[PDB]
Amino acid sequence: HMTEQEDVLAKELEDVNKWGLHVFRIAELSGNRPLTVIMHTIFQERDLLKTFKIPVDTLITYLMTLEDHYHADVAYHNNIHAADVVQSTHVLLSTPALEAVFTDLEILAAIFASAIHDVDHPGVSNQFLINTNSELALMYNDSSVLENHHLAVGFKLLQEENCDIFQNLTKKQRQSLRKMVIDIVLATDMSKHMNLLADLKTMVETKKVTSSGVLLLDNYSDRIQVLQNMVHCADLSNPTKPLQLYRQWTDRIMEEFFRQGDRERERGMEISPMCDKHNASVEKSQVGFIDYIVHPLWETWADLVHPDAQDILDTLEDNREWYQSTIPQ
Amino acid sequence: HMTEQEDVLAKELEDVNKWGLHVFRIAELSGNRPLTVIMHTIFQERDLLKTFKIPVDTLITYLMTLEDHYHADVAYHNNIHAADVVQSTHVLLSTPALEAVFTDLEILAAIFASAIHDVDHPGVSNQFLINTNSELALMYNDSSVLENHHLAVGFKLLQEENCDIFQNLTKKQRQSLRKMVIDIVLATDMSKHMNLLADLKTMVETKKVTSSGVLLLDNYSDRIQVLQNMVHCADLSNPTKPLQLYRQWTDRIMEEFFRQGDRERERGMEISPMCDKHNASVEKSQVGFIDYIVHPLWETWADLVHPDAQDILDTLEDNREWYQSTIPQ
Ligand SMILES: CCCCOc1cc(C[C@@H]2CNC(=O)N2)ccc1OC
Ligand SMILES: CCCCOc1cc(C[C@@H]2CNC(=O)N2)ccc1OC
Ligand SMILES: [Mg+2]
Ligand SMILES: [Mg+2]
Ligand SMILES: [Zn+2]
Ligand SMILES: [Zn+2]
């Protein structure tokens, strides 16, 4: 048996409540199982195994199969990105503006949704699967193709031998969870982003708070909408992390994009924007990504949970300043 | 070779442009192939084989497989209902208010959509497939489960040997058709009906007509919306047909509903509304169906194509009066 100083994985896992968790280091030290150990740590930390009577060996067995179904040959959409979205949602769930707001079931749904939200991603976009007449695009009628697929795989895996982590939820619990999880993952579809954000701004206009700053969320509609946006912000959280995490995420999305561009090229198709290795502006793309998508979203979020997300918003403008100012790589 | 007086099938098929076509008689006389002969007649009549260079043996082969994938053990959602929706859309396409309004591609899409809109229906509702945790509900995330499935089957069958009736459309034609067909079939989802109708009323408020009464439809949005509502009206056209057709449709939907109710019963589930053979009011249900769904829809349609649908609307109030007035069966 090892000493505290020796068990470097447990040591890193103590940072699970922090924005800026060294998730790549956790991936390396867990033997490429970041999703499994991070999910397990989060479930213990939130006392979710006890609350829903999830048997630990059932949780581990489900986590392993789910993690097995992220592709390790995909540079960005893989188990490490899933672990990062899970961990980022976990931190956002604990912002003071949201203190005691969500039930345990809603917390389960948000973390479970984050965990499966990209399962079995092939490293190519919805648009590429539509344009190449893939079996998934045919199956799903060109509409939210991957996000529909992530949901169906994440639920189906629950039926494997000893994988049903929801076996002791009541029928009604399982039905509400399912509903919430579907609503959250479908909302990760980037073609939904402009309306999601437009409607988030609208609900922030008429938000109600207790005198001590806690949000009041009285109904399903308002509750689910915060959770959809929360997970979406978690998904789009790379540029708000410490620069050295951020840069690694940027190298991985570019590598994945370039590989799609190469498939397009050998298939004789037009190369999609930002997917051409011979014609790339990595830094300018990040500045555009931040100016057009990431900052508008995080500014509205910070409004919703004011002043909780101020440091996140400062880091984001800093990283934007850095990508804007650097000498190209 | 037969005489005109002997070829009773060709004789019935001359009624293809009429509301009140004897579709059950066509089913019997075609050897249970109403969808095939009615689609073929409509394609010839509209000169669609020539316009899109569909080879006749390709059309027939696709029609036969598509018709084979409607279930003959299902009382209502079967090949005869598909043939009736196809034929009813065909007549609505020819209302004077819509004279020369739609391109040939849009006409193809509406008739093709009608033809596949219920393919492989199992005779049980979306809600039953969700409640029994079926593989389709899992696949499609509880959302438009059957309508997603109808689309995916109708497109997939095109890939069978000699079934590609769209082989000579340009890539861009095939892409617009696909888009239109998906938009039309997804709109047949009854959970979409209240919003479809609310939005149809809104567009009727600001509709524009030429001085001779032809609708002006300048953009995709307005065009697709009329086609969605057209096919939806065709789907919900049973109570607007001559009484003796109407009554046969009513016996078939009740029989299908009762069979679902029986599956629910033997599975020990609660029996869904109108699915309990031991507790049914066939006539009152039709009056409710007309008052709540069918008449509100057809009144708005008749507004849109005024005065074209007046006879349809008169027949509907007549049939409603009849079901209201009868001695229970
Ligand atoms: C390609 C450069 C511009 C965009 O950058 C990024 C884009 C994303 C969104 C991904 C890409 N596809 C998605 O559906 N979600 C995430 C991280 C990124 O960089 C760190
Ligand atoms: C069950 C009696 C009340 C409803 O009657 C009818 C309902 C329909 C709509 C069908 C039923 N399900 C659907 O998705 N579309 C069609 C014909 C009917 O009667 C002639
Ligand atoms: Mg995704
Ligand atoms: Mg249907
Ligand atoms: Zn993601
Ligand atoms: Zn139908």
Coordinates of C-alpha atoms in Angstrom, one line a residue, chain B residues 11-322:
Chain B
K11 CA -62.4 2.0 -64.8
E12 CA -62.1 2.8 -61.0
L13 CA -58.7 4.5 -61.6
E14 CA -60.4 7.0 -63.9
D15 CA -61.8 8.5 -60.6
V16 CA -58.2 9.4 -59.4
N17 CA -58.9 13.2 -59.6
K18 CA -62.1 13.0 -57.5
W19 CA -62.6 13.4 -53.8
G20 CA -64.5 10.2 -52.9
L21 CA -62.5 7.8 -55.0
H22 CA -63.6 4.2 -54.1
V23 CA -60.2 3.4 -52.6
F24 CA -61.4 0.1 -50.9
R25 CA -62.7 -1.1 -54.2
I26 CA -59.4 -0.2 -55.8
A27 CA -57.6 -2.2 -53.1
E28 CA -59.8 -5.2 -53.7
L29 CA -59.6 -5.0 -57.5
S30 CA -55.7 -4.4 -57.6
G31 CA -55.1 -7.6 -55.6
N32 CA -54.3 -5.5 -52.5
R33 CA -52.0 -3.1 -54.2
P34 CA -53.9 0.2 -54.0
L35 CA -50.7 2.2 -53.2
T36 CA -48.9 0.9 -56.2
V37 CA -51.6 1.4 -58.9
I38 CA -52.8 4.7 -57.4
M39 CA -49.2 6.1 -57.3
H40 CA -48.4 4.9 -60.8
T41 CA -51.6 6.4 -62.1
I42 CA -50.9 9.7 -60.4
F43 CA -47.3 9.8 -61.7
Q44 CA -48.5 9.2 -65.3
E45 CA -51.3 11.7 -64.9
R46 CA -48.9 14.4 -63.6
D47 CA -46.3 13.4 -66.2
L48 CA -43.8 12.9 -63.4
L49 CA -42.0 9.9 -65.0
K50 CA -41.1 12.0 -68.0
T51 CA -40.2 15.2 -66.0
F52 CA -37.8 13.3 -63.6
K53 CA -36.8 10.6 -66.0
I54 CA -38.1 7.9 -63.7
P55 CA -37.8 4.5 -65.5
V56 CA -41.3 2.8 -65.1
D57 CA -39.9 -0.5 -64.0
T58 CA -37.9 1.3 -61.3
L59 CA -41.1 3.1 -60.1
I60 CA -43.1 -0.1 -60.0
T61 CA -40.3 -2.0 -58.2
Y62 CA -40.0 0.8 -55.6
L63 CA -43.8 1.0 -55.2
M64 CA -44.0 -2.8 -54.6
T65 CA -41.3 -2.8 -51.9
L66 CA -42.8 0.3 -50.2
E67 CA -46.3 -1.3 -50.3
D68 CA -44.8 -4.5 -49.0
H69 CA -43.5 -2.6 -45.9
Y70 CA -47.0 -1.5 -44.8
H71 CA -48.4 -4.2 -42.6
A72 CA -51.5 -6.0 -43.9
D73 CA -52.4 -7.2 -40.4
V74 CA -52.8 -3.5 -39.2
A75 CA -56.6 -2.4 -39.6
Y76 CA -56.0 1.3 -40.2
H77 CA -52.4 2.3 -40.8
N78 CA -51.8 0.1 -43.8
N79 CA -51.3 0.4 -47.5
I80 CA -54.9 1.5 -48.1
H81 CA -54.6 4.4 -45.8
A82 CA -51.3 5.4 -47.5
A83 CA -53.0 5.2 -51.0
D84 CA -55.9 7.4 -49.6
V85 CA -53.5 10.0 -48.3
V86 CA -51.6 10.0 -51.6
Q87 CA -54.8 10.3 -53.6
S88 CA -56.2 13.0 -51.3
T89 CA -53.0 15.1 -51.5
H90 CA -53.2 14.7 -55.3
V91 CA -56.6 16.3 -55.3
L92 CA -55.7 19.1 -52.9
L93 CA -52.7 19.9 -55.1
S94 CA -55.1 20.7 -57.9
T95 CA -57.4 23.2 -56.1
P96 CA -57.9 26.3 -58.1
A97 CA -56.4 28.6 -55.4
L98 CA -53.1 26.7 -55.9
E99 CA -53.2 26.7 -59.8
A100 CA -49.6 26.6 -61.1
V101 CA -48.2 27.6 -57.7
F102 CA -45.9 24.6 -57.0
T103 CA -43.0 23.4 -59.0
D104 CA -42.8 19.8 -60.2
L105 CA -40.2 19.0 -57.5
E106 CA -42.5 20.3 -54.8
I107 CA -45.3 18.1 -56.2
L108 CA -43.1 15.1 -56.3
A109 CA -42.1 15.7 -52.7
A110 CA -45.7 16.1 -51.5
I111 CA -46.9 12.9 -53.2
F112 CA -43.8 10.9 -52.3
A113 CA -44.1 12.2 -48.7
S114 CA -47.8 11.0 -48.6
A115 CA -46.8 7.7 -50.0
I116 CA -44.2 6.9 -47.3
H117 CA -45.7 8.8 -44.4
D118 CA -46.9 5.7 -42.4
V119 CA -44.6 3.0 -43.8
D120 CA -43.9 0.1 -41.3
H121 CA -46.4 1.4 -38.8
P122 CA -46.9 -1.3 -36.2
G123 CA -50.5 -0.3 -35.3
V124 CA -49.6 1.3 -31.9
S125 CA -49.1 4.9 -31.1
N126 CA -46.0 6.9 -30.3
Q127 CA -47.1 7.0 -26.7
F128 CA -47.4 3.2 -26.4
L129 CA -43.9 2.7 -27.9
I130 CA -42.5 5.2 -25.4
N131 CA -44.4 3.6 -22.4
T132 CA -43.3 0.1 -23.3
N133 CA -39.6 1.2 -23.7
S134 CA -39.5 0.0 -27.3
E135 CA -36.4 -0.1 -29.5
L136 CA -37.8 2.7 -31.7
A137 CA -38.5 5.0 -28.8
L138 CA -34.9 4.3 -27.5
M139 CA -33.5 5.0 -31.0
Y140 CA -35.5 8.2 -31.5
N141 CA -35.3 9.6 -27.9
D142 CA -39.1 9.5 -27.4
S143 CA -39.5 12.2 -30.0
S144 CA -41.7 11.9 -33.2
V145 CA -40.8 8.2 -32.9
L146 CA -42.9 6.7 -35.7
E147 CA -42.7 9.7 -38.0
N148 CA -38.8 9.6 -37.8
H149 CA -39.1 5.8 -38.6
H150 CA -41.5 6.3 -41.6
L151 CA -39.0 8.7 -43.2
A152 CA -35.9 6.5 -42.5
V153 CA -37.7 3.4 -44.0
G154 CA -39.1 5.2 -47.0
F155 CA -35.7 6.6 -47.9
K156 CA -33.8 3.5 -47.2
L157 CA -36.0 1.4 -49.5
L158 CA -34.8 3.5 -52.4
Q159 CA -31.4 1.7 -52.1
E160 CA -32.8 -1.7 -52.9
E161 CA -32.1 -3.3 -56.3
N162 CA -33.7 -1.2 -59.0
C163 CA -35.7 1.0 -56.5
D164 CA -34.0 4.4 -56.9
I165 CA -36.8 6.5 -58.5
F166 CA -34.6 9.6 -57.8
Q167 CA -31.6 8.3 -59.7
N168 CA -31.9 11.0 -62.4
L169 CA -32.6 14.0 -60.1
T170 CA -29.6 16.3 -60.0
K171 CA -27.8 16.2 -56.6
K172 CA -29.4 19.6 -55.8
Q173 CA -32.9 18.3 -56.7
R174 CA -32.4 15.3 -54.5
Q175 CA -31.2 17.5 -51.6
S176 CA -34.3 19.9 -51.9
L177 CA -36.7 16.9 -52.2
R178 CA -35.2 15.2 -49.2
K179 CA -35.5 18.4 -47.2
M180 CA -39.1 19.0 -48.2
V181 CA -40.1 15.3 -47.6
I182 CA -38.6 15.4 -44.1
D183 CA -40.3 18.6 -43.3
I184 CA -43.7 17.3 -44.5
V185 CA -43.6 13.9 -42.7
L186 CA -42.4 15.2 -39.4
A187 CA -45.3 17.6 -39.5
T188 CA -47.8 14.6 -39.6
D189 CA -46.9 14.1 -35.9
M190 CA -50.3 14.7 -34.0
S191 CA -48.4 16.2 -31.0
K192 CA -47.5 19.0 -33.5
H193 CA -51.1 19.6 -34.6
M194 CA -52.0 22.5 -32.3
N195 CA -49.0 24.6 -33.3
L196 CA -49.3 23.7 -37.0
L197 CA -52.9 24.9 -36.9
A198 CA -52.1 28.0 -34.8
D199 CA -49.4 28.9 -37.3
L200 CA -51.6 28.2 -40.3
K201 CA -54.2 30.6 -39.0
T202 CA -51.5 33.3 -38.7
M203 CA -50.4 32.9 -42.3
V204 CA -54.0 33.0 -43.5
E205 CA -54.4 36.4 -41.8
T206 CA -51.7 37.9 -44.0
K207 CA -52.1 35.8 -47.1
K208 CA -51.9 37.5 -50.6
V209 CA -53.9 36.4 -53.6
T210 CA -53.9 37.4 -57.3
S211 CA -57.2 39.2 -58.4
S212 CA -58.4 35.9 -59.8
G213 CA -58.0 34.1 -56.4
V214 CA -54.6 32.3 -56.9
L215 CA -52.4 32.3 -53.7
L216 CA -49.0 34.0 -53.9
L217 CA -46.3 31.9 -52.1
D218 CA -42.9 33.7 -52.8
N219 CA -40.6 31.8 -50.5
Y220 CA -39.6 28.3 -49.2
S221 CA -41.2 29.0 -45.7
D222 CA -44.6 29.8 -47.1
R223 CA -44.5 27.0 -49.7
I224 CA -43.4 24.3 -47.3
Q225 CA -46.0 25.4 -44.7
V226 CA -48.9 25.0 -47.2
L227 CA -47.5 21.5 -48.2
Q228 CA -47.2 20.4 -44.6
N229 CA -50.7 21.5 -43.9
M230 CA -52.0 20.0 -47.1
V231 CA -50.6 16.5 -46.4
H232 CA -51.8 16.9 -42.7
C233 CA -55.4 17.7 -44.0
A234 CA -55.1 14.7 -46.4
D235 CA -54.1 12.5 -43.4
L236 CA -57.1 13.9 -41.4
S237 CA -59.5 13.7 -44.4
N238 CA -61.6 10.6 -43.4
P239 CA -64.6 12.6 -42.0
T240 CA -64.8 14.8 -45.1
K241 CA -65.3 11.9 -47.5
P242 CA -68.7 10.4 -48.5
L243 CA -70.3 8.8 -45.5
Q244 CA -69.9 5.3 -46.7
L245 CA -66.1 5.7 -47.0
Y246 CA -66.0 7.6 -43.7
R247 CA -67.7 4.7 -41.8
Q248 CA -65.3 2.1 -43.1
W249 CA -62.3 4.3 -41.9
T250 CA -64.0 4.6 -38.5
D251 CA -64.4 0.8 -38.2
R252 CA -60.7 0.3 -39.1
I253 CA -59.3 3.0 -36.6
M254 CA -61.5 1.5 -33.8
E255 CA -60.3 -2.0 -34.6
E256 CA -56.6 -0.9 -34.5
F257 CA -57.2 1.1 -31.3
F258 CA -58.9 -2.0 -29.6
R259 CA -56.0 -4.2 -30.5
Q260 CA -53.6 -1.7 -28.8
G261 CA -55.9 -1.6 -25.8
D262 CA -55.7 -5.4 -25.7
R263 CA -51.9 -5.4 -25.7
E264 CA -51.9 -2.9 -23.0
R265 CA -54.4 -5.1 -21.1
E266 CA -52.4 -8.3 -21.3
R267 CA -49.2 -6.4 -20.4
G268 CA -51.1 -5.2 -17.3
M269 CA -50.9 -1.5 -18.3
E270 CA -53.6 1.1 -18.0
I271 CA -55.8 1.2 -21.2
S272 CA -55.3 4.3 -23.3
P273 CA -58.3 6.6 -24.2
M274 CA -60.5 5.1 -26.9
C275 CA -58.7 1.8 -26.9
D276 CA -60.9 -0.2 -24.6
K277 CA -63.3 -2.4 -26.5
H278 CA -65.4 -2.9 -23.3
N279 CA -65.9 0.8 -22.8
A280 CA -66.2 2.6 -26.1
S281 CA -68.4 5.3 -27.6
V282 CA -67.6 5.1 -31.2
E283 CA -70.1 7.8 -32.3
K284 CA -69.3 10.3 -29.6
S285 CA -65.6 9.9 -30.3
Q286 CA -66.1 10.8 -33.9
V287 CA -68.1 13.9 -33.0
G288 CA -65.3 14.9 -30.6
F289 CA -62.7 14.1 -33.3
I290 CA -64.5 16.4 -35.7
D291 CA -65.4 19.2 -33.2
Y292 CA -61.9 19.3 -31.7
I293 CA -59.5 18.5 -34.5
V294 CA -60.9 17.9 -38.0
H295 CA -63.3 20.8 -38.3
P296 CA -60.9 23.4 -36.9
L297 CA -58.3 22.3 -39.3
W298 CA -60.6 22.1 -42.4
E299 CA -62.2 25.5 -41.7
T300 CA -58.7 27.1 -41.7
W301 CA -57.7 25.2 -44.8
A302 CA -61.0 26.4 -46.5
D303 CA -60.1 29.9 -45.5
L304 CA -56.7 29.5 -47.1
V305 CA -58.1 28.2 -50.4
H306 CA -61.5 30.0 -50.3
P307 CA -64.0 29.1 -51.8
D308 CA -62.4 25.8 -53.1
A309 CA -63.0 23.6 -50.0
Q310 CA -66.6 24.6 -49.4
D311 CA -68.1 21.2 -50.5
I312 CA -65.5 19.4 -48.3
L313 CA -66.6 21.5 -45.4
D314 CA -70.3 20.9 -46.1
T315 CA -69.8 17.1 -46.2
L316 CA -67.9 17.3 -43.0
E317 CA -70.7 19.1 -41.1
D318 CA -73.1 16.5 -42.6
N319 CA -71.1 13.6 -41.4
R320 CA -70.8 15.2 -38.0
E321 CA -74.6 15.7 -37.9
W322 CA -74.9 12.0 -38.9

